[PDB]
Design a protein around this ligand. Structure first.
Ligand SMILES: CCCCCCCCCCCCCC(=O)O
Ligand SMILES: CCCCCCCCCCCCCC(=O)O
Ligand SMILES: NCCCCCCCCCCCC(=O)O
Lengths: 289, 178, 60, 252, 252, 60
């Protein structure tokens, strides 16, 4: 069907257990050759006598759409209402889903993915700690601005650049529902690439990996009231919920912890946990030993 | 063996070792070390419920001149792990004859009081164990290695499904620039 | 110009459907396709040319 | 008359010349598990006659001051012939039962017993912040005894009849399948219970599907009635027993 | 190839990559007792899967000078799960069997075993004017051993292989259902035996319906073949087991 | 694709109905079934095989 539509029937039922009786033949379903690279299609009924079971179990929650389509925090940063640093008056990062692991490991199960994204922002502010704490600051209004690669970059909370005549921006005031919007599949290519065993330069050097393929611009966020007698500080959290998904060439789930955002680097890590012996099976069922 | 290719090799050998059990492990696909980091296991860990039959394929990697029969048994819960071949053969099992077909499939049929089991398994949702025994030792001609390895593969059958999405215990971080 | 389709069935073995209307000009704005359930394990579990009947030897 | 009645299961038959009726579950007769209700995939064993027949448990004595008695159920029949053997060898089991409580006296005796099958009779501890014992719960055949006063002791069930070991009003146990044995009119009680649980099958050692309680509400009494010995006997017959998940036998 | 073969009974499956054929009784597949052949009138129990499955007996070692081995049959499976329990609880029983003898070696080993099922294998005593023991006849699983010379002793079977404990020419045991295991070509033997007796049913403790004998005719041999250990394993599966005359269990 | 059914009758012996449309994809999201009124006391008050006519003795 069309993977852009918000409706589409059909139950995802698993297989019924076919009733099976005794057998004496040359059929040898339980004997295969794993060398071929084929995974055996044996079901219980091929190796034991089974009853018939009408199975209603469905695989609805393990569909790629339902697995990825849940908002995940992919970034968080702070900025102050007032400070001497100018820089600390606004936040900015470079769009990517590589800075928070949960989301990253989920995506990295697939080599390529294509999708629209529902972005939701959760912004909070707190009054900074100090000796004098009394003030009456009106509601804070924030501005989130997206700068596609190549656009002029803000240099202060009051730069002309925040005019957003063309960059898309969101103005939001505290106390209301978190801001939200959909972004289409924005790639230069036919699918976003999660891994790239390649370089940026033709001479097989330059930058290696995911980074050379990125370049989706950055986000800048600042307060608009711009002031507060006493210092305050806000935290902006951004969430991604992919929707209308397509994925290709699955790969094993990341086993070693991530070391940084630009690389696939890792330290050698254990295949799994140890146990006492290759025959160790704990004894449950005892008058409690 | 946690960081060496051995963790994947089940040792088996020529000579009299019948009393000696070849291996055994609990059937907790999303929880026990034997399974949790498996393709099936990693997937189960993103969910809280599972149900279905499981396929265990065993492949013999000795020389072609090697010979032998093994007993692969699965015991549903309720008793402790069989401690002898006598006890093990009273449950679900295949007798595997090593031959040109290098591999044998032990399918673990879904037998449970409930339609689903917790991936984070408890005694209430116990699934039993599978153990393996020499059915008739490994015989070999002269000039060939007297010991070899058997490998074991796992995969879900077509009656398998999972429910109730949750985060994996397996990945974490102490700070951003992740 | 709306669409009516069925709901995922809950707590029991006509009022089991919902209606939806799209209010935006871009497909990106639409909700997720949580109801599409296709499947093709074959790409991965059995990518062998020469069909393996498996009830037969597999070698020989 | 309709007081007369006979019942046959396997190689066993029961008779009464003074029955009331026969109570049937919540109106449901036992049935074997249907394909559209099953999960365990292996072929079941259905021993039939070897298993679905009348087993008689050890009798109890009704004394002028007996508070009552109880039995937990799948456990209690665990040593009864092949029904018990099939229990030991399988992980899962399922059965219904015909319960026949017998108690005869004379036209000059009087007393009244409530005979109830309580599904899922989770019991409370004597020691309020402690927990019970399997022993405080059941002793297989034999039978635990209710008590006329509050009990103490760690592990034992708080058994003052008045609260039926469950924290309710004993006189409300009638929403459960039951019959009364009023000596002046009746000499037995028969209840057919269907399998009741929130899963299609279950383990028979780990879960007491239901409890049988015999509680005298009007006490035994008589005169120079050279019959002071008035026993009560419980006979039960599994119905439609089926088992799944065969393996080695469970550890006693 | 037709060397490949699989068999499934109950929750158990056997496989071979080097079979000969499969021998069937005297051409007769096991069947359940028909109404026009029955005398015992009570309803039978037919446990089916719980009972008709593969039980593996304790293995034996084939040595360069092993004379042979034997097992008596309904007895021998008397402690095998529910098949044995049903034996203890019933007066009458009836069953057929799939017998699967396993023995693998190597293309550099040699030897040849005769595998036979002898119906009604009444055995003779060592002490010519004495009588046998049940012990001299069978030891359940395990297995009695034939001998290379004449034996003595009261109660033991005159077991010189040469006369098969029956007073005949061992080399004539072929009129009985059998297969050979010739190591150079074959690694197992499969015989399906139907119930054979002069009455429709019988007691399973008192009567050994048939004896399984494994007699090497050409002895085991090999060279620096770092494999001197060549075991033989017997797996058997009751077929169509049915039981009659239920009562308390028999005294061990 | 909506449903119209009647309201529970109030303060008096056509405008006595309401309309509803389901906006969610899961049945769990729907409102309660406050209008279903079946009943079967029998399971509990009369679970005796052998029908008791009661206008007749009940014993005898
Ligand atoms: C671009 C904003 C469009 C607003 C669309 C609202 C639709 C209101 C439901 C109207 C009744 C359904 C008509 C049919 O189709
Ligand atoms: C998933 C959100 C769906 C929003 C559904 C709103 C339905 C609006 C009423 C439209 C007029 C009724 C059409 C008929 O049926
Ligand atoms: N104001 C929001 C700007 C959003 C642009 C988001 C582009 C997200 C692309 C998702 C990329 C994930 C990947 O590399 O797989």
């Amino acid at each position: 069907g069309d993977v852009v539509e918000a409706v589409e029937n059909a139950v995802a039922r698993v297989a019924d257990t076919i009733g099976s009786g005794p057998s004496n033949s040359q059929a040898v379903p339980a004997l295969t050759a794993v060398e071929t690279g084929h995974t055996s299609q044996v079901t219980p009924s091929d190796t034991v006598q089974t009853r018939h079971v009408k199975n209603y179990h469905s695989r609805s929650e393990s569909s790629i759409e339902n697995f990825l389509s849940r908002s995940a925090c992919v970034y968080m940063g702070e900025y102050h209402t007032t400070n001497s640093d100018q820089t600390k008056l606004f936040a900015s990062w470079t769009i990517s889903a590589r800075r928070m692991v949960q989301m990253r490991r989920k995506l990295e199960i697939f080599t390529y993915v294509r999708f629209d994204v529902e972005v939701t922002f959760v912004i909070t502010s707190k009054q900074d700690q100090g000796t004098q704490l009394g003030q009456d600051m009106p509601p804070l209004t924030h501005q989130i601005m997206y700068i596609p690669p190549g656009g002029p970059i803000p240099k202060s909370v009051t730069d002309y650049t925040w005019q957003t005549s063309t960059n898309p921006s969101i103005f939001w005031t505290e106390g209301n529902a978190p801001p939200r919007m959909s972004i289409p599949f924005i790639s230069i290519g036919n699918a976003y690439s999660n891994f790239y065993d390649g370089w940026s330069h033709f001479s097989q050097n330059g930058v290696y990996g995911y980074n050379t393929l990125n370049h989706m611009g950055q986000i800048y966020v600042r307060h608009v009231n711009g002031s507060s007698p006493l210092p305050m500080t806000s935290t902006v959290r951004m969430y991604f919920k992919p929707k209308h998904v397509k994925a290709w060439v699955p790969r094993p789930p990341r086993l070693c912890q991530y070391k940084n955002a630009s690389t696939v680097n890792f330290s050698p890590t254990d295949i799994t946990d140890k146990r006492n012996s290759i025959t160790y099976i704990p004894d449950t069922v005892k008058p409690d030993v | 063996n946690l960081e060496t290719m051995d963790i994947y090799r089940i040792p088996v050998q020529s000579g009299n070792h019948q009393s000696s059990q070849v291996f055994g492990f609990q059937v907790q696909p999303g929880l026990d070390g034997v399974f949790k980091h498996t393709l099936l296991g990693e997937i189960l860990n993103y969910y809280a419920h599972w149900s279905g039959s499981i396929k265990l394929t065993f492949v013999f990697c000795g020389s072609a001149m090697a010979t032998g029969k093994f007993l692969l048994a699965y015991a549903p819960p309720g008793a402790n792990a069989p401690k002898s071949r006598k006890d093990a053969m009273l449950g679900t099992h295949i007798i595997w004859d090593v031959g040109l077909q290098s591999s044998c499939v032990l399918c673990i049929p879904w037998i449970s009081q409930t339609h689903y089991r917790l991936v984070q398994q408890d005694e209430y949702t116990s699934a039993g164990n599978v153990t393996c025994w020499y059915q008739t030792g490994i015989v070999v001609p002269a000039g060939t290695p007297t010991s070899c390895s058997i490998m074991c593969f796992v995969s879900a059958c077509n009656d398998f499904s999972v429910r109730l999405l949750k985060d994996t215990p397996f990945i974490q971080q102490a700070a951003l620039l992740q | 110009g709306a669409q009516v389709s069925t709901q995922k069935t809950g707590a029991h073995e006509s009022i089991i459907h919902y209606t939806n209307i799209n209010y935006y000009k871009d497909a990106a704005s639409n909700s997720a396709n949580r109801q599409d359930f296709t499947q093709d394990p074959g790409k991965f579990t059995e990518p062998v040319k020469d069909i393996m009947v498996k009830s037969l030897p597999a070698l020989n | 008359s309709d007081r007369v009645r006979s019942i046959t299961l396997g190689n066993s038959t029961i008779t009464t010349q003074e029955s009331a009726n026969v109570v049937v579950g919540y109106g449901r007769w036992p049935e074997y598990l249907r394909d559209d209700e099953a999960t365990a995939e292996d072929q079941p064993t259905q021993p039939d006659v070897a298993t679905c027949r009348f087993y008689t448990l050890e009798s109890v004595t009704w004394e002028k001051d007996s508070p009552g008695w109880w039995w937990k159920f799948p456990d209690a029949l665990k040593d009864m012939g092949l029904f018990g053997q099939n229990m030991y060898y399988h992980y899962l089991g399922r059965a219904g039962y015909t319960i026949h409580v017998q108690c005869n006296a004379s036209k000059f005796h009087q007393g009244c017993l409530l005979v109830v099958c309580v599904p899922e009779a989770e019991m409370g501890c004597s020691t309020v912040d402690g927990t019970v014992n399997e022993h405080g719960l059941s002793e297989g055949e034999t039978a635990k005894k209710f008590s006329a006063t509050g009990t103490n002791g760690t592990n034992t069930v708080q058994s003052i009849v008045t609260n039926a070991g469950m924290g309710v009003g004993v006189g409300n146990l009638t929403i459960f399948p039951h019959q009364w044995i009023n000596l002046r009119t009746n000499n037995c009680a028969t209840i057919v219970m269907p399998y009741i649980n929130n899963v299609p099958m279950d383990n028979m050692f780990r879960h007491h599907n239901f409890t049988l309680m015999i509680i005298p509400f009007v006490p035994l009494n008589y005169s120079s009635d050279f019959s002071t010995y008035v026993p009560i006997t419980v006979t039960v017959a599994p119905m439609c027993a089926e088992y799944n998940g065969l393996r080695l036998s469970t550890a006693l």
